[PDB]
């Protein structure tokens, strides 16, 4: 399996309700392992998976120190951007930062990411070369010139290709029982088909990990129904993921159609058909 | 592990 580590930062200004709300979460693949919320009592980075609890007091002091320096950067940024965009002090505004690294099944570097948004839109993004910037508009071009002059891309390259991949590798080892698990989806079939000529068949997938899955509906051959009705993959809340896909068929031709479930943890691709 | 470099103001 390929793997990723990602950190997600949100700050929201709230004039006359004091300092920006700041929330940080870390992920390994689809498992959250840390967070910081400026409104909680701890004022600390806190564990959110059992395998990060192995880390000693220096980890938690360090990540607390660093997450607050990130928070302080966003506070300044919210002020700066109100200036760049000529905005009042009245409104709530959002800054977002995402960064991290992907590795392949050999756990070697594939790709690095460092991206910033303002009010839900792209502001500045590190390109795949880990030295070029995409600036969304005139304001982001000011930021671009400042971050070029200071060699921000060179600093990020050192973390993205080095630090990020080896701490990802450390987490994948220490959390081996969670993170390298592959829970195959428990599947089944529902027939909710209360039309005269037409039946609708939903093909279910519960308790799987990771969240990556494919729910093809097939017919006689072809393989395709561009008319499938699949809900966004959702958290079960226990650390596993749920999904289904739906196709509308004739009430006669019940058992001419096949659900093709694909998951990393299934030896062979499953293949389900309406059983009375 | 968080970045400890490459975090500057916009």
């Amino acid at each position: 399996g390929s793997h990723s580590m990602r950190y997600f930062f949100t700050s929201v200004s709230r004039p006359g309700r004091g300092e920006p709300r700041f929330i940080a979460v870390g992920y390994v693949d689809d498992t959250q392992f840390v967070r910081f919320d400026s409104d909680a009592a701890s004022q600390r980075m806190e564990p959110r998976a059992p395998w990060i609890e192995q880390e000693g007091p220096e980890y938690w002091d360090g990540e607390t120190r660093k997450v607050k320096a990130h928070s302080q950067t966003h506070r300044v940024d919210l002020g700066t951007l109100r200036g760049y965009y000529n905005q009042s002090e009245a409104g709530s505004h959002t800054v977002q930062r995402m960064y991290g690294c992907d590795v392949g099944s050999d756990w070697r570097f594939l790709r690095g990411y460092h991206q910033y948004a303002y009010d839900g839109k792209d502001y500045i993004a590190l390109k795949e070369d880990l030295r070029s910037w995409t600036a969304a508009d005139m304001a982001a071009q000011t930021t671009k010139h400042k971050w070029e002059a200071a060699h921000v891309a060179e600093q990020l390259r050192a973390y993205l290709e080095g630090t990020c991949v080896e701490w990802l590798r450390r987490y994948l080892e220490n959390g081996k029982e969670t993170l390298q698990r592959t829970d195959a989806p428990k599947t089944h079939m529902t027939h909710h088909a209360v039309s005269d000529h037409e039946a609708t068949l939903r093909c279910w997938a519960l308790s799987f990990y990771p969240a990556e899955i494919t729910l093809t509906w097939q017919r006689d051959g072809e393989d395709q129904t561009q008319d499938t009705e699949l809900v966004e993959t959702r958290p079960a809340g226990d650390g596993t993921f749920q999904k289904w896909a739906a196709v509308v068929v004739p009430s006669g031709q019940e058992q001419r159609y096949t659900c093709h479930v694909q998951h990393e943890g299934l030896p062979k691709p499953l293949t389900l058909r309406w059983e009375p | 592990l968080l970045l400890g470099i490459g975090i500057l103001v916009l």
């Epitope: 220096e58 607050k68 302080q72 | 470099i5 500057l8």
Partner: T-cell receptor
Framework: SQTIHQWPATLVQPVGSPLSLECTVE??????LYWYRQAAGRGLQLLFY??????ISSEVPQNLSASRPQDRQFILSSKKLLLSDSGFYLC?????????????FGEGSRLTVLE | QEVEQNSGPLSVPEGAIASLNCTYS??????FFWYRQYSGKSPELIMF????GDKEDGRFTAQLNKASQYVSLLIRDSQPSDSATYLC?????????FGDGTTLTVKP
């Protein structure tokens, strides 16, 4: 342009006296501010770290205290100095956030406490 | 110990290359510093490095190896005025951790 001044430069004080060291930076805003001490050798113990105005992180249980009443104003104090508070006290700033992490030091405050 | 450098004093003849070394134990460290400190004075940055390999700036070359966990400083063509305490530092845990210094005397 960018500037860090600390005061006083040298102090000789009796055990039990109060301490006030001041540090001032010009030509930057929202800096990280640090108090380090050099005692019983070279190399630097972090005493206080401040990520921003009003925010003081104490890095060792100690007889000293720090405050940052404005952006560019960092203060180190004690009500009752001990013999063991003797040292070279260094104020430093770094750019807002986590850049290269280069520290700009003040010219330092040399404190001798005498019985 | 987090940042280890020999105390010296390290004696080097005028015109020879001084070799300063530093090891760090925390693999979370993401940049690396040499500061110079004259007796009585405050530390002053010689250079920083955050990429594996060598970085040259005139007479000074920093070397970083994140696999071995070592930072070196080489001073070409050493002068008596380079006599100082050289402080190795590591940016880890959102702050600079300092070594206890290497004292260098360049004999004229």
């Amino acid at each position: 342009s960018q500037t860090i001044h600390q005061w006083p430069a040298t102090l000789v004080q009796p055990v039990g006296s109060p301490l006030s060291l001041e540090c001032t930076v010009e030509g930057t805003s929202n800096p990280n501010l640090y108090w380090y001490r050099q005692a019983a050798g070279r190399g630097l113990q972090l005493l206080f770290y401040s990520v921003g105005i009003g925010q003081i992180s104490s890095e060792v249980p100690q007889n000293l205290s720090a405050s940052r009443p404005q952006d560019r104003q960092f203060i180190l104090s004690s009500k009752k100095l001990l013999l063991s508070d003797s040292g070279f006290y260094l104020c430093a700033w770094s750019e807002t956030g986590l850049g290269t992490g280069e520290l700009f030091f003040g010219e330092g405050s040399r404190l001798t406490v005498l019985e | 110990q987090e940042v280890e450098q020999n105390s010296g004093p390290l004696s080097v003849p005028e015109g020879a290359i001084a070799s300063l070394n530093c090891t760090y134990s925390d693999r979370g460290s993401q940049s690396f510093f040499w500061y110079r400190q004259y007796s009585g004075k405050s530390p002053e940055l010689i250079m920083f490095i955050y990429s594996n390999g060598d970085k040259e700036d005139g007479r000074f070359t920093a070397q970083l190896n994140k696999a071995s966990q070592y930072v070196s400083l080489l001073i070409r063509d050493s002068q008596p005025s380079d006599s100082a305490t050289y402080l190795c530092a590591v940016n880890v845990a959102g702050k600079s951790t300092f070594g206890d210094g290497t004292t260098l005397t360049v004999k004229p």
